[PDB]
Structures are given as structure tokens and as C-alpha cells.
Amino acid sequence: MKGYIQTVTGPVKKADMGLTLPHEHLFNDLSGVVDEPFYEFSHVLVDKKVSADIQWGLKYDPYCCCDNMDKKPIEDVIFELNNFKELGGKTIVDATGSSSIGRDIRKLKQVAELTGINVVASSGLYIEKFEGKRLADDIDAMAKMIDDELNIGIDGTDIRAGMIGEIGVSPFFTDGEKNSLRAAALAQNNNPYASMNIHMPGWQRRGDEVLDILLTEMGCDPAKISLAHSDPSGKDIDYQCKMLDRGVWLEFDMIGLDISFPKEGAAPSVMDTVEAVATLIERGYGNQIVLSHDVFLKQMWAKNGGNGWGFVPNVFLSLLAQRGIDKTIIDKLCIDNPANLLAAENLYFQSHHH
Amino acid sequence: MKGYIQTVTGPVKKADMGLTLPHEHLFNDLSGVVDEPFYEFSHVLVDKKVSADIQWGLKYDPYCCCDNMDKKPIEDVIFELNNFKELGGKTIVDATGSSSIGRDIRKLKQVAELTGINVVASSGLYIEKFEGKRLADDIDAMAKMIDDELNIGIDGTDIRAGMIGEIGVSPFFTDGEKNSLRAAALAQNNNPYASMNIHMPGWQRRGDEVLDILLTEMGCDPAKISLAHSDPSGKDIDYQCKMLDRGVWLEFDMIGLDISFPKEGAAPSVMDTVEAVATLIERGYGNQIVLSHDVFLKQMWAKNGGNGWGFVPNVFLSLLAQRGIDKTIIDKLCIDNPANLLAAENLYFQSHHH
Ligand SMILES: [Mn+2]
Ligand SMILES: [Mn+2]
Ligand SMILES: [Mn+2]
Ligand SMILES: [Mn+2]
């Protein structure tokens, strides 16, 4: 009851969230993991500024380009956000939950004030590759940190997070990552409105072991848990329905990503995901799906020839409609659904303790 | 023997062609078939100038945008060509073979002179949708026209074509289109160095009936025939090998196209085509494959965030190398192969008659 989201400028009631994107990165910095150029052509990308003129290459080796991986200028973030705003965009979640990946709580507040968009910050440790020993801390300590960031503030400020995540599960699902997941669960069970977004290794099928921890062991409310990067398992209907049957949300947050990673594999096409999401809706699971773009690289901005933050509510929703999905469901996918995931009260834990 | 290509500034010997793109459009104009906006979002595209900022939409409804479909400014063509030149690009084929689709023989010559790139013009009637009654002419008359454009010149000039094509076979393969194919065959059999490029309905499997006409009926040299738009049949190995076994070239000319057409279907991904082409090479057919981009819309230019004319020799070739194809074959795919298709002498017809 009384569902709401804690934004960077205060609480917003569930009914007031409107068109919402539940998994994006407004301010992140991946500067400490620029990769060496992977291919013979990649060397020319390395020191170049991201623009439309190098999409040809960035779509095959995004991580070799320093600029692509560097901090995001506020001017550029606001320009791209004004795109979403023009379509009736009202709320956006920054899933940059850790200093490991450049969370910038003060710029998030700045952008909310300038644009009037509801901006939700996150708290959560990422994969061991970025976090190192931070995942080896006591689970209670890690949980306390997340609890403080949700209820008191971040980085010495009074600006609070509204989501737990994105919690890092790597393709190696390390013992530290498992510890991190347990800490996130403890924090969630102390915070009646907080959803938990899990970064999944999308080209793997690790959902059952993740949910054995969150659901079976830690006793979390499945309706407050979302599995990120579900997109690359979209052809695997049996796996996806198995997860949905455990009561969690599947998040297709790579819509319009349009990049091939030299290691981890190539992102599904928009049409691939249209078919997956449409088939899940036909199977009765429309009320358990959320959609986003996971903008996390400068190449993804529309001003650079990427798809930006308008693509899901404008293009993808139109594609679903052409595929014959009913308008009533389509209208829920980017409004009611993310509002319920992010803001509905937990059914198992309705008190916040000290 | 003595293989060569007739370019817009004169003959170039086969050995001097270098890095060659055998299927592109430098100057074309599709202004008379702008489609109505297909989707709810498409209306904003209609009157906008193509830029990186509307790729989001043009990738799903390219033909509704008037600017995208209009004539190509020479400044823009030269900028994009200088990209290819920088990679050692030496020769490019404009497959705009008809006034129906805006062939501009004088601008082709202009660009060759300004850039030093060997530019090959084409002669050939397109699909009935564009050509109408022009396909209902006497086959001998149609053949004479193609013969004159190869040997005397185009549009009152002394600038000649060097390729027959792209010959229009629509998804309806009309009687007119069949007539057009026969005229192209007659012209080829009178022109010992001219290759014939057939626009195929790529999401269909019409190759056997096309080749029954060209090969069985008209007696053409299969080694001078290329089937365009083979890309969307790349998963259909049995069909593709059946065509290759008849001795013709398969052209994968949609590499880096990255567009979904609302009717005809979505283009294969670059990685899809990497796998198809690699598997054909592993099957022994590497000497029967050519590669191109089919740049035909302003959205495809690199300056707009498309992949431009550098993508095949830079990115695709690197991808094939990562997939473990041998360098000796990779070096042939964009040099020896297109030179042989375009410039080798016909084995069946070695005299030009009047
Ligand atoms: Mn993630
Ligand atoms: Mn993310
Ligand atoms: Mn064509
Ligand atoms: Mn073409």
C-alpha cells in the first residue's frame, strides 16, 4: 500500500510515475577497464571522440575507445533526456549503483532539477571484476551500506537511492558475488518498497541458482526482484518461463543496444526481442515484463546515431503493436509494469527496522 | 584473356582494379516511391533531413523519409568515397542501371575525376514496379539498348557502362521481368567482358528459375553472372550451394545494411553473414563469393552513423579472420574475386558483334 519511489529529489507516488525506464545509466565511468583494441581496425577508434562517424567500428569494439568509456557530460545527458521527455517520459532509473562504475549522485540530482524528470539512483555492488575485495566484506556490513544509501544518503549527501542494484552476477558467479547477492537480499528485506535489479550474465542461464539464493534461501518477495539482461535468453522460452513461474520480473533492458561485444557475444536484434516479448505476453506473462535500453556508452546516445532513450516507448511499442499485441497490454508495459516493480510494497516485509 | 573493366573514364585492366566494391549506388533517386509512414512513430521522419539523430527511426521505416530517398549530393558522395580511398579502395561499381532509379552518368564521371577512384556505371532495367511498360518492349530492342550503353555511351554522352545490371527480379517475377532478363542475356552474349548482376528477391528462393532462364535457356556463362542480395538466404546452405554448383557468383551485398523493412523483412546481421560466408568458404566455394554494402539510402552513409563504404574491407574481413578463415582467401574476397567477376572474359562468347 501507498507505493512510491524515492527519487533524488524526494518521494514520488506510484500513480505519478508515468512513462518510466527502469534500467539505464545516466552517469557512469568505465575508464578503468578500457580494453586493448581487439581487431585490426580497432586501433583508429582508441583515441577518437565518439561520433556518428565511427559507429561503423564502435558497434564491434565498443570498449577499446576511451571517450566511449569515460564520464558523461551533463550537457550530453540532458540533451538525450529531453528526447525522452518529449514523448511524455516522466521517470528514469540510473542503475549505476556503485562508485566502482562511476555513480554521480550530485549530477543525478542536478539533472532531475533541470529537466523535471523523476530520477531514481541505485545502491548495489557490481561484479567482482570492478569491485574486488569490496565483495569480501561481512554480509551485514554490505547490507548496512545499502540500507544507509536508501534511507540516509549517498557519498556524504542527503540524496538517497530508490533501487537496490544493479547487483553484479558475472559469468563466473564468484563467492564474492554470491555474498553481494545475500547482502542485497538482507537490505531488501529491511526496505518495504525497494526493488532489486540483478545484473545477469545474459548469455548464460544462471537464473535458477540466483533465485535459489534470493528466493529459497533469503526469502525475498519475487515481485520485488528483476533479472536484468534477459534479452539474450529470449529464444530460450523454457528457461524464461521457468524464471517467470518463480514469480520474478524479466527485464529486457538491451532494446536497441545494437552492439556486438568481442567476448561476451552479440546483442539480440530488436526484432528478436519483439518476438520474444510478444510470445511471453501470448503465454500470459505480460504483467511480469519490463523494458529498457541500458544506455551505458556514449555510442548509444541518439546524438551519436544510437537509439537513445526514446526508442522503447516509440519504436519497440509500435513494433509490438504491428505484431498484434493488444493496446491495453502495450500501454502497461512502460507505465504500470515498471511502476509496480519499482514502487509496489513488498508482500513479505512491510516494516523498515533500525 | 586481357580482362578489363570499362569505367566512366575508360578501360582498366583486371590486375589494376585493387580493392573493389562490386555493388553500390553512388547516385540514385527513389523520390517517386516515398512510402506513407508505416508506424505510429514514422510521421516525424517524413520531412526531416537524414542525420545521426533519426537513425533510431530510419532503421525501421527508411522509405517514408523523403530526404533519404532523394538524389545524392556530389559533396556527400565524395566525402564517403574518401573513406574507402583511405583504406586502399581503388574501384567501385554503381549498380544504378536505369533512369527509373536515377542513374547519373555525368556525376559518376565527375566523381571518378575528382577522386581518382575507378567508377564503373551499369546498364540494366530494374523491377516492373519502377519500369512499367519499359519491360514490355521487344527483347531485341532492350538488348540493343544495353549493348549501346556498354559500347557507345549513356544518355547522349560518350560515357559507357561496364556492367549489366542490376536486373530487376521482383518477388512477383513478372513476365516483363523475365523479358528483361532475356534481353540482359542477349546483351551479355554480345559483350565478352560484361558481367550481369541480378537483383534477386532476397527473402525468396527464386535462383533456380532465374538460372533456368540465364543458363539453360539463354546459354550464358555462369562465371559472368552474379546473384545480388544473397545475404537473406545465408542460413539456407542447401539453396546457396545449389546455386553455387550451377557455377554462378553469390553476392552478399547487404553487409552492414542494418535496416528492417516494414514489408520485405529485416536484413541479416553482420554476424549472421560472417557465419554464412565462412561456412561457404569451408565448403570450398570461396572463389565464387563477392561482398558489398549496397549503399542506396542516405542513412547508410558513415557521416550519418551508417556503415559507409569502408565497412566490408575493414570490419567484415576482420570478423572473418577472427572466425578463423585463412588470410590467403580473405585477401582474395575483395580483390581477386570481384576483379574476376567483373573483368574476366566470358568463356562462351569472345566476340562483340554489330
Ligand atoms: Mn548490467
Ligand atoms: Mn546496466
Ligand atoms: Mn537490388
Ligand atoms: Mn543495389
mmCIF file with all atom_site columns, N, CA and C in Angstrom, chain A residues 133-189:
data_model
loop_
_atom_site.group_PDB
_atom_site.id
_atom_site.type_symbol
_atom_site.label_atom_id
_atom_site.label_alt_id
_atom_site.label_comp_id
_atom_site.label_asym_id
_atom_site.label_entity_id
_atom_site.label_seq_id
_atom_site.pdbx_PDB_ins_code
_atom_site.Cartn_x
_atom_site.Cartn_y
_atom_site.Cartn_z
_atom_site.occupancy
_atom_site.B_iso_or_equiv
_atom_site.pdbx_formal_charge
_atom_site.auth_seq_id
_atom_site.auth_comp_id
_atom_site.auth_asym_id
_atom_site.auth_atom_id
_atom_site.pdbx_PDB_model_num
ATOM 1   N N  . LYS A 1 133 ? 37.897 -6.716  -3.552  1.00 0.00 ? 133 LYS A N  1
ATOM 2   C CA . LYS A 1 133 ? 37.721 -7.063  -2.168  1.00 0.00 ? 133 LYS A CA 1
ATOM 3   C C  . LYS A 1 133 ? 36.483 -6.488  -1.489  1.00 0.00 ? 133 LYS A C  1
ATOM 4   N N  . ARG A 1 134 ? 35.872 -5.495  -2.116  1.00 0.00 ? 134 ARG A N  1
ATOM 5   C CA . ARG A 1 134 ? 34.638 -4.907  -1.561  1.00 0.00 ? 134 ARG A CA 1
ATOM 6   C C  . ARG A 1 134 ? 33.540 -5.960  -1.413  1.00 0.00 ? 134 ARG A C  1
ATOM 7   N N  . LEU A 1 135 ? 33.588 -7.006  -2.222  1.00 0.00 ? 135 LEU A N  1
ATOM 8   C CA . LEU A 1 135 ? 32.581 -8.086  -2.109  1.00 0.00 ? 135 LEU A CA 1
ATOM 9   C C  . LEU A 1 135 ? 32.888 -9.094  -1.016  1.00 0.00 ? 135 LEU A C  1
ATOM 10  N N  . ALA A 1 136 ? 34.117 -9.060  -0.504  1.00 0.00 ? 136 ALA A N  1
ATOM 11  C CA . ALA A 1 136 ? 34.560 -9.965  0.548   1.00 0.00 ? 136 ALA A CA 1
ATOM 12  C C  . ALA A 1 136 ? 34.244 -9.429  1.947   1.00 0.00 ? 136 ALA A C  1
ATOM 13  N N  . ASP A 1 137 ? 33.622 -8.248  2.044   1.00 0.00 ? 137 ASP A N  1
ATOM 14  C CA . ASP A 1 137 ? 33.212 -7.729  3.349   1.00 0.00 ? 137 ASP A CA 1
ATOM 15  C C  . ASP A 1 137 ? 32.119 -8.586  3.997   1.00 0.00 ? 137 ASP A C  1
ATOM 16  N N  . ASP A 1 138 ? 31.899 -8.380  5.292   1.00 0.00 ? 138 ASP A N  1
ATOM 17  C CA . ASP A 1 138 ? 30.866 -9.049  6.040   1.00 0.00 ? 138 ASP A CA 1
ATOM 18  C C  . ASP A 1 138 ? 29.512 -8.722  5.367   1.00 0.00 ? 138 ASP A C  1
ATOM 19  N N  . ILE A 1 139 ? 28.650 -9.717  5.231   1.00 0.00 ? 139 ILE A N  1
ATOM 20  C CA . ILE A 1 139 ? 27.353 -9.522  4.559   1.00 0.00 ? 139 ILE A CA 1
ATOM 21  C C  . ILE A 1 139 ? 26.556 -8.467  5.307   1.00 0.00 ? 139 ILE A C  1
ATOM 22  N N  . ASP A 1 140 ? 26.566 -8.498  6.637   1.00 0.00 ? 140 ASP A N  1
ATOM 23  C CA . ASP A 1 140 ? 25.859 -7.468  7.404   1.00 0.00 ? 140 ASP A CA 1
ATOM 24  C C  . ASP A 1 140 ? 26.361 -6.045  7.124   1.00 0.00 ? 140 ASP A C  1
ATOM 25  N N  . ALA A 1 141 ? 27.667 -5.881  6.979   1.00 0.00 ? 141 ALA A N  1
ATOM 26  C CA . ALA A 1 141 ? 28.233 -4.596  6.659   1.00 0.00 ? 141 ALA A CA 1
ATOM 27  C C  . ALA A 1 141 ? 27.790 -4.094  5.291   1.00 0.00 ? 141 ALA A C  1
ATOM 28  N N  . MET A 1 142 ? 27.798 -4.998  4.315   1.00 0.00 ? 142 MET A N  1
ATOM 29  C CA . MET A 1 142 ? 27.385 -4.675  2.954   1.00 0.00 ? 142 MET A CA 1
ATOM 30  C C  . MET A 1 142 ? 25.914 -4.285  2.916   1.00 0.00 ? 142 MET A C  1
ATOM 31  N N  . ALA A 1 143 ? 25.100 -5.014  3.672   1.00 0.00 ? 143 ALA A N  1
ATOM 32  C CA . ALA A 1 143 ? 23.688 -4.720  3.769   1.00 0.00 ? 143 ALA A CA 1
ATOM 33  C C  . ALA A 1 143 ? 23.434 -3.384  4.440   1.00 0.00 ? 143 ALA A C  1
ATOM 34  N N  . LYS A 1 144 ? 24.163 -3.120  5.502   1.00 0.00 ? 144 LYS A N  1
ATOM 35  C CA . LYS A 1 144 ? 24.052 -1.822  6.173   1.00 0.00 ? 144 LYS A CA 1
ATOM 36  C C  . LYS A 1 144 ? 24.346 -0.665  5.213   1.00 0.00 ? 144 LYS A C  1
ATOM 37  N N  . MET A 1 145 ? 25.378 -0.823  4.373   1.00 0.00 ? 145 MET A N  1
ATOM 38  C CA . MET A 1 145 ? 25.732 0.205   3.396   1.00 0.00 ? 145 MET A CA 1
ATOM 39  C C  . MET A 1 145 ? 24.570 0.499   2.453   1.00 0.00 ? 145 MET A C  1
ATOM 40  N N  . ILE A 1 146 ? 23.986 -0.556  1.920   1.00 0.00 ? 146 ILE A N  1
ATOM 41  C CA . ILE A 1 146 ? 22.841 -0.397  1.019   1.00 0.00 ? 146 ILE A CA 1
ATOM 42  C C  . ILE A 1 146 ? 21.642 0.254   1.761   1.00 0.00 ? 146 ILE A C  1
ATOM 43  N N  . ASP A 1 147 ? 21.389 -0.221  2.955   1.00 0.00 ? 147 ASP A N  1
ATOM 44  C CA . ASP A 1 147 ? 20.309 0.357   3.792   1.00 0.00 ? 147 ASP A CA 1
ATOM 45  C C  . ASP A 1 147 ? 20.538 1.865   4.015   1.00 0.00 ? 147 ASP A C  1
ATOM 46  N N  . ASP A 1 148 ? 21.785 2.242   4.354   1.00 0.00 ? 148 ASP A N  1
ATOM 47  C CA . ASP A 1 148 ? 22.095 3.677   4.556   1.00 0.00 ? 148 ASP A CA 1
ATOM 48  C C  . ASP A 1 148 ? 21.932 4.515   3.298   1.00 0.00 ? 148 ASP A C  1
ATOM 49  N N  . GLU A 1 149 ? 22.291 3.975   2.125   1.00 0.00 ? 149 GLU A N  1
ATOM 50  C CA . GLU A 1 149 ? 22.168 4.687   0.874   1.00 0.00 ? 149 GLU A CA 1
ATOM 51  C C  . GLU A 1 149 ? 20.690 4.858   0.468   1.00 0.00 ? 149 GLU A C  1
ATOM 52  N N  . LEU A 1 150 ? 19.863 3.886   0.838   1.00 0.00 ? 150 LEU A N  1
ATOM 53  C CA . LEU A 1 150 ? 18.417 4.021   0.586   1.00 0.00 ? 150 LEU A CA 1
ATOM 54  C C  . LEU A 1 150 ? 17.728 4.996   1.531   1.00 0.00 ? 150 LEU A C  1
ATOM 55  N N  . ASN A 1 151 ? 18.164 5.068   2.776   1.00 0.00 ? 151 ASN A N  1
ATOM 56  C CA . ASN A 1 151 ? 17.391 5.765   3.830   1.00 0.00 ? 151 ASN A CA 1
ATOM 57  C C  . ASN A 1 151 ? 17.997 7.080   4.322   1.00 0.00 ? 151 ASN A C  1
ATOM 58  N N  . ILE A 1 152 ? 19.311 7.213   4.236   1.00 0.00 ? 152 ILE A N  1
ATOM 59  C CA . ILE A 1 152 ? 20.029 8.402   4.750   1.00 0.00 ? 152 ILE A CA 1
ATOM 60  C C  . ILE A 1 152 ? 20.639 9.244   3.613   1.00 0.00 ? 152 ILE A C  1
ATOM 61  N N  . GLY A 1 153 ? 21.465 8.616   2.783   1.00 0.00 ? 153 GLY A N  1
ATOM 62  C CA . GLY A 1 153 ? 22.002 9.260   1.618   1.00 0.00 ? 153 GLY A CA 1
ATOM 63  C C  . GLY A 1 153 ? 23.289 8.645   1.135   1.00 0.00 ? 153 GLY A C  1
ATOM 64  N N  . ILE A 1 154 ? 23.791 9.225   0.049   1.00 0.00 ? 154 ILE A N  1
ATOM 65  C CA . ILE A 1 154 ? 24.944 8.716   -0.686  1.00 0.00 ? 154 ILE A CA 1
ATOM 66  C C  . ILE A 1 154 ? 26.110 9.705   -0.656  1.00 0.00 ? 154 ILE A C  1
ATOM 67  N N  . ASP A 1 155 ? 27.278 9.162   -0.372  1.00 0.00 ? 155 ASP A N  1
ATOM 68  C CA . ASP A 1 155 ? 28.552 9.881   -0.534  1.00 0.00 ? 155 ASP A CA 1
ATOM 69  C C  . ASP A 1 155 ? 28.598 11.168  0.308   1.00 0.00 ? 155 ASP A C  1
ATOM 70  N N  . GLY A 1 156 ? 27.995 11.095  1.474   1.00 0.00 ? 156 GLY A N  1
ATOM 71  C CA . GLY A 1 156 ? 28.023 12.230  2.393   1.00 0.00 ? 156 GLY A CA 1
ATOM 72  C C  . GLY A 1 156 ? 26.856 13.172  2.201   1.00 0.00 ? 156 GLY A C  1
ATOM 73  N N  . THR A 1 157 ? 26.063 12.955  1.158   1.00 0.00 ? 157 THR A N  1
ATOM 74  C CA . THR A 1 157 ? 24.904 13.804  0.885   1.00 0.00 ? 157 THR A CA 1
ATOM 75  C C  . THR A 1 157 ? 23.634 13.282  1.555   1.00 0.00 ? 157 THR A C  1
ATOM 76  N N  . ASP A 1 158 ? 22.562 14.051  1.408   1.00 0.00 ? 158 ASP A N  1
ATOM 77  C CA . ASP A 1 158 ? 21.257 13.576  1.824   1.00 0.00 ? 158 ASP A CA 1
ATOM 78  C C  . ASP A 1 158 ? 20.458 13.060  0.648   1.00 0.00 ? 158 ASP A C  1
ATOM 79  N N  . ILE A 1 159 ? 21.120 12.764  -0.461  1.00 0.00 ? 159 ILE A N  1
ATOM 80  C CA . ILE A 1 159 ? 20.423 12.255  -1.656  1.00 0.00 ? 159 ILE A CA 1
ATOM 81  C C  . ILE A 1 159 ? 20.439 10.730  -1.577  1.00 0.00 ? 159 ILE A C  1
ATOM 82  N N  . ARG A 1 160 ? 19.248 10.143  -1.660  1.00 0.00 ? 160 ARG A N  1
ATOM 83  C CA . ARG A 1 160 ? 19.042 8.720   -1.420  1.00 0.00 ? 160 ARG A CA 1
ATOM 84  C C  . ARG A 1 160 ? 18.789 7.951   -2.732  1.00 0.00 ? 160 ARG A C  1
ATOM 85  N N  . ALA A 1 161 ? 19.132 6.666   -2.688  1.00 0.00 ? 161 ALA A N  1
ATOM 86  C CA . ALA A 1 161 ? 18.758 5.711   -3.718  1.00 0.00 ? 161 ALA A CA 1
ATOM 87  C C  . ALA A 1 161 ? 17.328 5.245   -3.521  1.00 0.00 ? 161 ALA A C  1
ATOM 88  N N  . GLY A 1 162 ? 16.773 4.733   -4.621  1.00 0.00 ? 162 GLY A N  1
ATOM 89  C CA . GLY A 1 162 ? 15.405 4.192   -4.656  1.00 0.00 ? 162 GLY A CA 1
ATOM 90  C C  . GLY A 1 162 ? 15.321 2.757   -5.189  1.00 0.00 ? 162 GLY A C  1
ATOM 91  N N  . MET A 1 163 ? 16.469 2.168   -5.550  1.00 0.00 ? 163 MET A N  1
ATOM 92  C CA . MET A 1 163 ? 16.555 0.804   -6.071  1.00 0.00 ? 163 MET A CA 1
ATOM 93  C C  . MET A 1 163 ? 17.860 0.184   -5.562  1.00 0.00 ? 163 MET A C  1
ATOM 94  N N  . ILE A 1 164 ? 17.782 -1.096  -5.300  1.00 0.00 ? 164 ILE A N  1
ATOM 95  C CA . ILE A 1 164 ? 18.935 -1.936  -4.972  1.00 0.00 ? 164 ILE A CA 1
ATOM 96  C C  . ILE A 1 164 ? 19.425 -2.547  -6.261  1.00 0.00 ? 164 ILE A C  1
ATOM 97  N N  . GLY A 1 165 ? 20.650 -2.226  -6.646  1.00 0.00 ? 165 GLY A N  1
ATOM 98  C CA . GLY A 1 165 ? 21.187 -2.752  -7.861  1.00 0.00 ? 165 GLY A CA 1
ATOM 99  C C  . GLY A 1 165 ? 22.139 -1.794  -8.517  1.00 0.00 ? 165 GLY A C  1
ATOM 100 N N  . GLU A 1 166 ? 22.612 -2.129  -9.721  1.00 0.00 ? 166 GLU A N  1
ATOM 101 C CA . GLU A 1 166 ? 22.422 -3.459  -10.324 1.00 0.00 ? 166 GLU A CA 1
ATOM 102 C C  . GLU A 1 166 ? 23.466 -4.380  -9.671  1.00 0.00 ? 166 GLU A C  1
ATOM 103 N N  . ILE A 1 167 ? 22.979 -5.477  -9.117  1.00 0.00 ? 167 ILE A N  1
ATOM 104 C CA . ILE A 1 167 ? 23.796 -6.360  -8.316  1.00 0.00 ? 167 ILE A CA 1
ATOM 105 C C  . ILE A 1 167 ? 24.575 -7.254  -9.281  1.00 0.00 ? 167 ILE A C  1
ATOM 106 N N  . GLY A 1 168 ? 25.897 -7.260  -9.161  1.00 0.00 ? 168 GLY A N  1
ATOM 107 C CA . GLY A 1 168 ? 26.712 -7.946  -10.147 1.00 0.00 ? 168 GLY A CA 1
ATOM 108 C C  . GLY A 1 168 ? 26.822 -9.449  -10.027 1.00 0.00 ? 168 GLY A C  1
ATOM 109 N N  . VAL A 1 169 ? 26.259 -10.177 -11.007 1.00 0.00 ? 169 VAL A N  1
ATOM 110 C CA . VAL A 1 169 ? 26.499 -11.623 -11.146 1.00 0.00 ? 169 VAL A CA 1
ATOM 111 C C  . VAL A 1 169 ? 27.264 -11.780 -12.469 1.00 0.00 ? 169 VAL A C  1
ATOM 112 N N  . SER A 1 170 ? 28.552 -12.154 -12.387 1.00 0.00 ? 170 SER A N  1
ATOM 113 C CA . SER A 1 170 ? 29.388 -12.320 -13.555 1.00 0.00 ? 170 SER A CA 1
ATOM 114 C C  . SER A 1 170 ? 29.214 -13.738 -14.135 1.00 0.00 ? 170 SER A C  1
ATOM 115 N N  . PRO A 1 171 ? 29.806 -13.970 -15.302 1.00 0.00 ? 171 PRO A N  1
ATOM 116 C CA . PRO A 1 171 ? 29.787 -15.316 -15.876 1.00 0.00 ? 171 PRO A CA 1
ATOM 117 C C  . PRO A 1 171 ? 30.531 -16.350 -15.053 1.00 0.00 ? 171 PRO A C  1
ATOM 118 N N  . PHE A 1 172 ? 31.281 -15.914 -14.020 1.00 0.00 ? 172 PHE A N  1
ATOM 119 C CA . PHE A 1 172 ? 31.964 -16.790 -13.088 1.00 0.00 ? 172 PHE A CA 1
ATOM 120 C C  . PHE A 1 172 ? 31.243 -16.943 -11.728 1.00 0.00 ? 172 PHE A C  1
ATOM 121 N N  . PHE A 1 173 ? 30.120 -16.205 -11.558 1.00 0.00 ? 173 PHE A N  1
ATOM 122 C CA . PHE A 1 173 ? 29.374 -16.138 -10.282 1.00 0.00 ? 173 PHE A CA 1
ATOM 123 C C  . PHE A 1 173 ? 30.231 -16.462 -9.072  1.00 0.00 ? 173 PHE A C  1
ATOM 124 N N  . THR A 1 174 ? 31.100 -15.513 -8.709  1.00 0.00 ? 174 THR A N  1
ATOM 125 C CA . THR A 1 174 ? 32.065 -15.773 -7.695  1.00 0.00 ? 174 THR A CA 1
ATOM 126 C C  . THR A 1 174 ? 31.465 -15.841 -6.289  1.00 0.00 ? 174 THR A C  1
ATOM 127 N N  . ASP A 1 175 ? 32.236 -16.346 -5.321  1.00 0.00 ? 175 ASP A N  1
ATOM 128 C CA . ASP A 1 175 ? 31.770 -16.413 -3.940  1.00 0.00 ? 175 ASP A CA 1
ATOM 129 C C  . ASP A 1 175 ? 31.443 -14.996 -3.419  1.00 0.00 ? 175 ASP A C  1
ATOM 130 N N  . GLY A 1 176 ? 32.224 -14.032 -3.886  1.00 0.00 ? 176 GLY A N  1
ATOM 131 C CA . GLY A 1 176 ? 32.016 -12.609 -3.508  1.00 0.00 ? 176 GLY A CA 1
ATOM 132 C C  . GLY A 1 176 ? 30.690 -12.095 -4.064  1.00 0.00 ? 176 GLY A C  1
ATOM 133 N N  . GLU A 1 177 ? 30.429 -12.466 -5.309  1.00 0.00 ? 177 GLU A N  1
ATOM 134 C CA . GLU A 1 177 ? 29.168 -12.094 -5.959  1.00 0.00 ? 177 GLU A CA 1
ATOM 135 C C  . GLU A 1 177 ? 27.997 -12.731 -5.254  1.00 0.00 ? 177 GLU A C  1
ATOM 136 N N  . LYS A 1 178 ? 28.141 -13.990 -4.829  1.00 0.00 ? 178 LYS A N  1
ATOM 137 C CA . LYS A 1 178 ? 27.089 -14.608 -4.033  1.00 0.00 ? 178 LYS A CA 1
ATOM 138 C C  . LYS A 1 178 ? 26.839 -13.889 -2.692  1.00 0.00 ? 178 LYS A C  1
ATOM 139 N N  . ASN A 1 179 ? 27.913 -13.463 -2.022  1.00 0.00 ? 179 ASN A N  1
ATOM 140 C CA . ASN A 1 179 ? 27.897 -12.669 -0.768  1.00 0.00 ? 179 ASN A CA 1
ATOM 141 C C  . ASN A 1 179 ? 27.143 -11.339 -0.990  1.00 0.00 ? 179 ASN A C  1
ATOM 142 N N  . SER A 1 180 ? 27.485 -10.699 -2.098  1.00 0.00 ? 180 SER A N  1
ATOM 143 C CA . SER A 1 180 ? 26.875 -9.425  -2.535  1.00 0.00 ? 180 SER A CA 1
ATOM 144 C C  . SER A 1 180 ? 25.365 -9.610  -2.716  1.00 0.00 ? 180 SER A C  1
ATOM 145 N N  . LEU A 1 181 ? 24.964 -10.717 -3.348  1.00 0.00 ? 181 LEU A N  1
ATOM 146 C CA . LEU A 1 181 ? 23.559 -11.016 -3.533  1.00 0.00 ? 181 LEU A CA 1
ATOM 147 C C  . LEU A 1 181 ? 22.839 -11.192 -2.177  1.00 0.00 ? 181 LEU A C  1
ATOM 148 N N  . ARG A 1 182 ? 23.465 -11.915 -1.241  1.00 0.00 ? 182 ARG A N  1
ATOM 149 C CA . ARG A 1 182 ? 22.880 -12.106 0.062   1.00 0.00 ? 182 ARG A CA 1
ATOM 150 C C  . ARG A 1 182 ? 22.731 -10.784 0.812   1.00 0.00 ? 182 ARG A C  1
ATOM 151 N N  . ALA A 1 183 ? 23.744 -9.916  0.727   1.00 0.00 ? 183 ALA A N  1
ATOM 152 C CA . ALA A 1 183 ? 23.659 -8.591  1.348   1.00 0.00 ? 183 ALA A CA 1
ATOM 153 C C  . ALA A 1 183 ? 22.515 -7.757  0.751   1.00 0.00 ? 183 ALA A C  1
ATOM 154 N N  . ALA A 1 184 ? 22.370 -7.841  -0.567  1.00 0.00 ? 184 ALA A N  1
ATOM 155 C CA . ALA A 1 184 ? 21.267 -7.140  -1.230  1.00 0.00 ? 184 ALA A CA 1
ATOM 156 C C  . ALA A 1 184 ? 19.921 -7.646  -0.733  1.00 0.00 ? 184 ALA A C  1
ATOM 157 N N  . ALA A 1 185 ? 19.822 -8.947  -0.534  1.00 0.00 ? 185 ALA A N  1
ATOM 158 C CA . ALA A 1 185 ? 18.571 -9.587  -0.031  1.00 0.00 ? 185 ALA A CA 1
ATOM 159 C C  . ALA A 1 185 ? 18.252 -9.100  1.369   1.00 0.00 ? 185 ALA A C  1
ATOM 160 N N  . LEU A 1 186 ? 19.260 -9.068  2.239   1.00 0.00 ? 186 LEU A N  1
ATOM 161 C CA . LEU A 1 186 ? 19.033 -8.577  3.588   1.00 0.00 ? 186 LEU A CA 1
ATOM 162 C C  . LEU A 1 186 ? 18.571 -7.146  3.622   1.00 0.00 ? 186 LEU A C  1
ATOM 163 N N  . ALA A 1 187 ? 19.218 -6.314  2.806   1.00 0.00 ? 187 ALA A N  1
ATOM 164 C CA . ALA A 1 187 ? 18.796 -4.916  2.664   1.00 0.00 ? 187 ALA A CA 1
ATOM 165 C C  . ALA A 1 187 ? 17.382 -4.788  2.130   1.00 0.00 ? 187 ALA A C  1
ATOM 166 N N  . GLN A 1 188 ? 17.045 -5.557  1.118   1.00 0.00 ? 188 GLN A N  1
ATOM 167 C CA . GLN A 1 188 ? 15.683 -5.511  0.571   1.00 0.00 ? 188 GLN A CA 1
ATOM 168 C C  . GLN A 1 188 ? 14.679 -5.883  1.649   1.00 0.00 ? 188 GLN A C  1
ATOM 169 N N  . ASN A 1 189 ? 14.988 -6.915  2.430   1.00 0.00 ? 189 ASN A N  1
ATOM 170 C CA . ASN A 1 189 ? 14.007 -7.378  3.410   1.00 0.00 ? 189 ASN A CA 1
ATOM 171 C C  . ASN A 1 189 ? 13.819 -6.380  4.543   1.00 0.00 ? 189 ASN A C  1
#
